[PDB]
Swiss-Prot record:
Catalytic residues (UniProt): E294
Molecular function in Gene Ontology: alanyl aminopeptidase activity; aminopeptidase activity; identical protein binding; metallopeptidase activity; zinc ion binding
Binding site residues for substrate: E117, G257, A258, M259, E260, N261
EC nos: 3.4.11.2
Record-stated family: Belongs to the peptidase M1 family.
Organism: Escherichia coli (strain K12)
Coiled-coil ranges (or none): none
Protein name, UniProt field: Aminopeptidase N
Membrane topology: Peripheral membrane protein
Gene it is expressed from: pepN
Residues binding Zn(2+), per UniProt: H293, H297, E316
């Protein structure tokens, strides 16, 4: 499989302007007729090169003449000797029932549905399957009326009919030109939740959420969230929906999350279906996020699309930024920022230190489905956020507005977007552009000096990015470095120099620089990289007391949390080293006291307290180390929990009880109280065994919502409480028929600290609720084991690696996209000790040798073994 390169982009030799599709739908044999209107832009002698995969070609006509000047080649239909302008007619057959990869037209249960991003449309017909070819679609769908009463495509219905032999048809037209990755088709029998949204200018939009029969009870929150998304995009960004109908279809079989097909989004049901007994607060807020995200793409992705796939972050960085801003405005901004930074530092930085490292605008791709990454998405969004930091809201929105004025109805590049921001704001983003081309995490080192003679405070700030596997050369970035200086009372010291204010966002643009501040009347405590102002590792020699000072006094809630993270990091590192020498946890009294103070502080937001009382995950902890010792990290996390449980027992139980809520509401203040209560319950579970067992079992049985029930169940498994096996069986007996609810239970099984977790997981391959045909079940059992139980995955006997190789050997053939997601923990081998590296390398070597190795896995495996 051959790599493609960004620098190789060239405008297409032919465009398509209009495509009329007819589907004669059948799960075993679907016939596609595609009539395209084409224009040659390149040389007269250049053939038309159409992409296609696993298609049975029936016929090729050019202006209704059966064509003889063509050939099929791997992946392609090459058509020669064409006029400058012509009508192409292709007829071909495809087989949805055989499509286990879930790419193209496939079956989800009894429904037929599509996934076309990135390159799935070529699995449906021969086409210019590249996102700089925009065309107007018309789609006619013919099917059995009893099996497929609903026949959906993008846009509005223009024609409908009934045929003999129980077939019917519907034809759709979408006026907006689109690249083919935004094509969608759905056929099936559904319950339908119908609502309306009226835009601020008065356009009434019909909203339609399509769910499997008997799931309407789980649909209102998704609808609520759609309307919220629409309203917010109007309020914040000034953008209105542009069509008459907005359709969402929830399907159970889906490799991604959800997909922004124009006017006909297709969602994994995990990101739609919720009711209070089936879904947690986090589920509710994730549905809100993903509903938002796909809606937001209607502008950032659909009305302006991507010139080529290397520009994916153009839509994904900006749409994730928008989803974050949406959640943050509606909810707790600080809890959002905290959890997005946890993702960045715990998951994204690992990718940027791995063999799959890439810039947010990649330069080299083998399989584009491998580049829907933490980097492109979440780091992408941090890059957008940095532009927002540099410009301010008002200039940022002027940039947005210039971007749409210039590029609406076209396919654009990341550079176009930056230029629009630069030109609208008059802020120079030339250096800033290097964030798009350079991979890896910058390390920002900060030293400080306070001169009492002159009342000056000096920060000496250096940067460097280490080389990564993909790039041997690195250069300094334009790093927006936000600070705040605090006096001995906790009050912010005004920043100034030579009699003038200085902006608190420092422009860290060199390898080394100094910043001098005047009229600093007291030695300050600095808050550095405020709100995570750039996606970098910060090196500052913090005292413990500077960090507890910030926890008490810092103005922004994020800074209070971040200071707690910096204080814990020192002691996580200390205790991992101790664990490797067989020595028990050591924690200063003053550290425990800082967490006690947070528990008893009446003035702190409970949302913030809960996050400070949520220890860094085993992933966030791994980021603190060059070489990862996953057993030490897991055991240190447990011991730290037990230590705090003991030291803070009385305070934890008081706050647990104080935050009891008898009514359940999906409302942010309520959520905050509940997160705090369950944060306390986690520590209590790791306390004295009898009290723990009582508290946890009672919460599980008495809960009136899934948040509380699952928090108890997860604590029983994490602390290996007596009640665990009863409660787990209880859950299975109640919920086994409900795959989305059972996913939570598979995750708890896979992430268990029990010694026999792998045996349990293997046995669960045969569980009544598990199936290898469903990506959500696969992720929830196998994925969670490999990725979220690094202590068991990395068992010294190598059993974890062997288990993953077995599963990958199936999935490589069945569903390469899911396989490539699941191989990630093995490609991290260079972070582990030699003995583990040797076992992981052997596992990788085994997979490299598979018959019919997918491109998706080939790419990762070859990088890993280099
Ligand atoms: C370790 N890997 C592959 C991932 N770990 C966690 N989240 C991921 C990962 N790969 C992609 N994502 C998320 O998928 C979403 C897009 O499908 C992005 N939001 C990205 O974070
Ligand atoms: Zn997206």
């Amino acid at each position: 499989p051959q790599a493609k390169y960004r620098h190789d982009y060239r405008a297409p030799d032919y465009q398509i302007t209009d495509i009329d599709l007819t589907f004669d739908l059948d799960a075993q044999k679907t016939v596609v007729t595609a009539v395209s209107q084409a224009v040659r832009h390149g040389a007269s002698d250049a053939p038309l090169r159409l992409n296609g995969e696993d298609l049975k070609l029936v016929s090729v006509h050019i202006n209704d003449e059966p064509w003889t000047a063509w050939k099929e080649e791997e992946g392609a239909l090459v058509i020669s000797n064409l006029p400058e302008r012509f009508t192409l007619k292709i007829i071909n057959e495809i087989s949805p029932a055989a499509n286990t990869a879930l790419e193209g037209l496939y079956q989800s249960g009894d429904a037929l549905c599509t996934q076309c991003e990135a390159e799935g449309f070529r699995h449906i017909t021969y086409y210019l399957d590249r996102p700089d070819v925009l065309a107007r679609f018309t789609t006619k769908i013919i099917a059995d009326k009893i099996k497929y009463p609903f026949l959906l495509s993008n846009g509005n219905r223009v024609a409908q009919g009934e045929l003999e032999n129980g077939r019917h048809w519907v034809q759709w037209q979408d006026p907006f030109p689109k690249p083919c990755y935004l094509f969608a088709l759905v056929a099936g029998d559904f319950d339908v939740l119908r609502d309306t949204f009226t835009t601020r200018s008065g356009r009434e939009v019909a909203l339609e959420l399509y769910v499997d029969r008997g799931n309407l009870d789980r649909a209102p929150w998704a609808m609520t969230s759609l309307k919220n998304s629409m309203k917010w995009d109007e309020e914040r960004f000034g953008l209105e929906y542009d069509l008459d109908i907005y359709m969402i279809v929830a399907v159970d079989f889906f490799n991604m999350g959800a997909m922004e097909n124009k006017g006909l989004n297709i969602f994994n049901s995990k990101y739609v279906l919720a009711r209070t007994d089936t879904a947690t607060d986090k589920d509710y807020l994730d549905i809100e996020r993903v509903i938002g995200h796909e809606y937001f793409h209607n502008w950032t992705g659909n009305r302006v699309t991507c010139r080529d796939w290397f520009q994916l972050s153009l839509k994904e960085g900006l749409t994730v930024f928008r989803d974050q801003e949406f959640s943050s405005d509606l909810g707790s901004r600080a809890v959002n920022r905290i959890n997005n930074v946890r993702t960045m530092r715990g998951l994204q930085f690992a990718e940027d230190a791995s063999p799959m490292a890439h810039p947010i605008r990649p330069d080299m791709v083998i399989e584009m489905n491998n580049f829907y990454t933490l980097t492109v998405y979440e780091k992408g969004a941090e890059v957008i956020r940095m532009i927002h930091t540099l410009l301010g809201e008002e200039n940022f929105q002027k940039g947005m507005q210039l971007y749409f004025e210039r590029h609406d109805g076209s396919a654009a590049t990341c550079d176009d977007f930056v230029q629009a921001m630069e030109d609208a704001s008059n802020v120079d983003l030339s250096h800033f552009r290097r964030w798009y081309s350079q991979s890896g995490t910058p390390i920002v080192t900060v030293k400080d000096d306070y001169n009492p003679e002159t009342e000056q405070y000096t920060l000496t700030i250096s940067q460097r990015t280490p080389a990564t596997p993909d790039q041997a050369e690195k250069q300094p970035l334009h790093i927006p470095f936000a600070i705040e200086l605090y006096d001995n009372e906790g009050k912010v010291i005004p920043l100034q120099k030579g009699g003038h204010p200085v902006n608190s966002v420092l422009n860290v643009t060199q390898a080394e620089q100094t910043f001098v501040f005047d009229n600093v009347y007291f030695q300050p405590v600095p808050a550095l990289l405020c709100e995570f102002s750039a996606p970098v590792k910060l090196e500052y020699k913090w005292s413990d007391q500077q960090l507890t000072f910030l926890m008490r006094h810092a103005r922004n809630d994020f800074s209070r949390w971040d200071a707690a993270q910096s204080l814990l990091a020192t002691y996580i590192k200390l205790n991992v080293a101790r664990h490797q020498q067989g020595q028990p946890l050591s924690l200063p009294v003053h550290v425990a006291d800082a967490f006690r103070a947070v528990l008893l502080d009446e003035k702190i937001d409970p949302a913030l307290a809960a996050e400070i009382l949520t220890l860094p995950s085993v992933n966030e902890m791994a980021e603190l180390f060059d070489i990862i010792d996953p057993i030490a990290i897991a055991e240190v996390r447990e011991a730290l929990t037990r230590t705090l449980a003991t030291e803070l027992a009385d305070e934890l139980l008081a706050i647990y009880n104080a935050n009891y809520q008898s009514e359940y509401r999906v409302e942010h203040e309520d959520i905050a109280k509940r997160t705090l209560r369950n944060a306390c319950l986690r520590f209590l579970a790791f306390g004295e065994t009898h009290l723990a067992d009582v508290l946890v079992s009672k919460q599980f049985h008495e809960a009136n919502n899934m948040t509380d029930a699952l928090a108890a169940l997860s604590a029983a498994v994490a602390a290996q409480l007596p009640c665990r096996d009863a409660l787990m069986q209880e859950y299975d007996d109640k919920w086994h028929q409900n795959g989305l609810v059972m996913d939570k239970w598979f995750i708890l099984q896979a992430t268990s600290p029990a010694a026999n977790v792998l045996e349990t997981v293997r046995g669960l391959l045969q569980h009544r609720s598990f199936t290898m045909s469903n990506p959500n079940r696969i992720r929830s059992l196998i994925g969670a084991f490999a990725g979220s139980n690094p202590a068991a995955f990395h068992a010294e006997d190598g059993s974890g690696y062997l288990f993953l190789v077995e599963m990958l050997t199936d999935l490589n053939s069945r569903n390469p996209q899911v396989a490539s997601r699941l191989i990630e923990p093995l490609i991290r081998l260079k972070r582990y000790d030699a003995k583990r590296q040797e076992k992981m390398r052997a596992a990788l070597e085994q997979l490299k040798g598979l018959e019919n190795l997918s491109g998706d896995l080939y790419e990762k495996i070859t990088k890993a073994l280099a």
